[PDB]
C-alpha cells in the first residue's frame with residue numbers, strides 16, 4: 001500500500017488512489033500523525049477524484065530523527081512530490097496546523113494550480129495563551145508527555161467515537177520528544193509571525209477558494225469572526241460541524257468528504 | 268507484510284509464503300503494477316506450494332526513479348532474488364508483458380531449474396497496429412495519460428468485477444511517465460525484436476512446459492493460432508477463460524491458480 | 535510498521551497504546567516478526583502501551599546484517615525502547631526469543647524489568663530431533679533439510695488454523711544466513727547454560743518470570759516446573775489446554791490475561 005519517494009533529499013511517504021479527471025485531492029495531516037488520519041474519508045475521496053495522501057518528512061515508516069524543519073519544508077516537499085507524480089491542479093485537505101503548509105502551498109503555486117483548500121479545525125484567532133503555554137511544555141524534555149496528554153484530552157473532549165479514540169490511542173505511535181518539541185516550535189512561531197491564520201490568508205497574493213470546517217474551536221463568537229471574515233472575502237467559506245472532537249475528518253468522514261467534494265465543485 | 272532485498276544494486280520488493288516440497292511458484296506482474304496483482308490468487312497458490320511474489324525494480328514501495336532498464340534486468344533481478352533465497356526449481360506465473368521476462372528467465376536457467384512457465388493474457392500474435400499505437404502513445408510526454416486510459420478501457424471491457432476495478436483504479440498508483448514510457452519502449456522493442464511471444468518461445472534452447480491462460484482477444488482466429496501452436500509443440504498448452512477482462516489472475520483467481528497447480532503437477 | 539536505526543541496524547517495531555504503567559514489549563522467535571503477536575495485540579494494547587519489536591534483519595529490510603547473537607538482540611531492543619522513552623516494561627517472548635528476554639532482564643534489573651513472560655521454551659536440554667535440526671540448519675550442504683526439520687518440530691502435526699497459517703506463511707524471506715544463525719545461536723544458549731532454568735538461576739536479581747505453554751504435554755515436564763517453582767517463588771507456570779507450540783497465536787486471549795495478571799504483580 002504505502003509508497004515513498006525522495007523529495008528535497010528526504011523520504012516522503014504517500015499513497016495515490018483513483019483516476020477520475022479534474023483536481024486531485026491532496027490530504028495533509030497534522031503534526032505527529034500520518035496518512036491514516038484520512039482512512040475514514042479515503043473511500044469517499046477516491047470515488048470522487050484521484051486522491052494523494054501525503055505524509056510529512058519524518059512521519060513515514062522511517063522514524064529516524066530528521067534534520068530540523070517547519071512549514072517551508074512541508075510545502076516544498078508536498079509540492080515536489082506532486083510535480084513528481086504529475087499532479088496538475090489539486091485541492092489540499094489539511095488537518096489543524098497542517099493548514100499552515102496548505103496555505104503556503106496555495107500561495108506558492110497560485111489559484112489555477114491550487115483552486116481551493118479545505119482546512120480542518122485550525123485555530124483562526126491569535127494563539128490563546130493557554131495554547132502557547134502547551135506549545136512550550138512539549139518542548140520541555142522532562143514534561144513533554146504531560147503537554148501531549150493535556151492537548152489530547154482537550155482534543156477528545158470526552159468523546160466515545162471509536163475511530164477518533166483508536167486513532168489517538170493506537171494509530172499515532174512511534175513519535176517522541178523530537179517531533180513534539182518541533183511541533184511546538186513551528187506552531188508557536190507560525191502564530192508569532194502571522195498573528196493568526198486569517199491574517200496569513202489575507203496576505204495571499206491571489207486567494208484561491210478556502211473553506212474552514214471545524215467542530216471545536218469554541219461555541220461561540222469564534223463563529224462571528226468567521227461570518228465577519230466570510231463577509232469581507234468572497235473566496236472564504238466555513239462550516240461549524242457539531243462534532244465532539246478536534247478530529248472532524250476522522251469523527252465525521254463522510255460529511256467532511258462531502259464538504260471537500262462540494263468545495264471542489266464550486267471552483 | 269512486504270520485504271525487500273538489494274539485488275544487482277537495486278531494491279527488489281517481494282514476499283515469500285508457504286512451505287511445501289517441490290517447485291516454488293514465482294509471481295511476476297505486468298508493467299506498472301506490483302504483487303497485489305496476485306492478492307486474489309495467493310491463498311490458493313500458497314496452500315499448494317511455497318510462493319514468492321516478486322516486484323520489478325522501481326515497482327516496490329520505493330518509487331524513486333531508477334535508471335533505464337528492460338527485460339534483461341527484470342530477468343536478472345528476479346533470478347538474483349531467488350538465488351539469494353536459495354530457491355531451487357520454480358514456476359513463474361507472469362501477467363501480460365511480464366511474460367517476456369518469464370521466458371527470458373526460463374531460457375537463462377533451463378528446464379530443470381524452471382520446469383514450467385504460466386503466462387496470463389499476453390498477446391501471442393504480432394502486435395496489432397492499434398496496440399503499437401498505444402505503445403507509442405505512452406511514450407509521448409504530453410499524452411501518455413490518454414494512452415493509459417485508453418488501454419485501461421480495453422482491459423476492463425464492461426466488467427463489474429470489483430477486484431479488477433479496484434486493482435486498476437486504486438491499487439496501481441504511484442507511477443507516471445517515466446515508467447509508462449519505459450513499458451512502451453520495452454514492449455515495442457520486444458515485439459519488433461522477436462515478432463511475437465510465440466516466436467520467442469520457439470527460440471528457447473530447451474522449451475519448458477509453457478501454458479497460456481487468457482480471456483481477452485475475442486474468440487476466433489486467436490484460438491486457432493493457439494490450436495496450431497499446441498499441435499506443433501507438445502510443451503505448449505493453453506486455456507481460454509470466460510472472463511471479461513485482461514486480468515484473469517484477478518478476475519478468476521481460483522481458476523487460474525488451479526491451472527498453475529495443474530501445470531506444475533504435469534512437469 | 536515503523537523502523538528506527540539502533541546500533542547501526544534497522545529495527546522494525548510498532549507502538550500502540552497509552553495506558554500508564556509498565557509497557558508490554560513483544561519479542562518473536564527466530565525467523566518471525568511482529569505478526570507473531572497480531573492475535574494478542576488487541577488485548578495487550580487495551581491494557582498497556584505495547585511495543586512489538588523485531589530482531590535485527592527480521593524487519594521488512596531483508597538484506598543481510600552483521601552476525602549477531604543474544605547480546606545484540608538484547609542491546610538492539612534496549613536501544614529502541616530508550617529511543618521510544620519506555621521506562622519499566624514486561625517482555626513477552628516466544629520460544630528462544632526467551633533467551634534474549636532473560637538477558638534484557640538481567641542487564642536492566644528488576645525495577646526496570648519487573649517481570650518476563652515466556653511462551654513455550656523447552657525448559658530441559660533440547661530433545662534430540664530438535665538438536666539435530668539445529669546442527670543441520672548450519673551445514674551449507676543440508677541446511678534446507680535442517681530448516682524443514684526445524685519447521686516440522688514447530689508444527690507438531692497440529693490442525694489449528696491461526697498456527698498453521700503462522701508457521702507456514704509468516705516465516706519466509708530468510709535464507710541460509712539467518713536460518714543457520716538461528717541454529718547456531720539456539721544451540722549456543724543450550725551449550726552455555728544447559729537449560730533456560732539454569733539461565734534463570736543465574737540472574738543477578740530475578741524478576742517475576744512466568745512460562746506459558748501447552749506442549750511438552752507429559753507428566754515429567756510438569757514435575758520439573760513444580761520442582762523449580764518449589765525452589766523459586768519468583769517462577770510461575772501455566773499449562774494451557776492447547777495443542778500447539780504457539781500459545782500466543784492459538785490462545786491469544788488466555789495468554790494476554792496471564793500477561794496482564796503477571797504485570798499486576
Ligand SMILES: CCCCCCCC(=O)Nc1ccccc1C(=O)O
Nearest residue numbers: 297298299300363364435439450451
Ligand atoms: C494504472 C493502472 C495500470 C494497471 C497496470 C497493469 C499492467 C498491464 O497489465 N499491462 C500493460 C502495461 C503497460 C503497457 C501495456 C500493457 C498491456 O498489458 O498490454
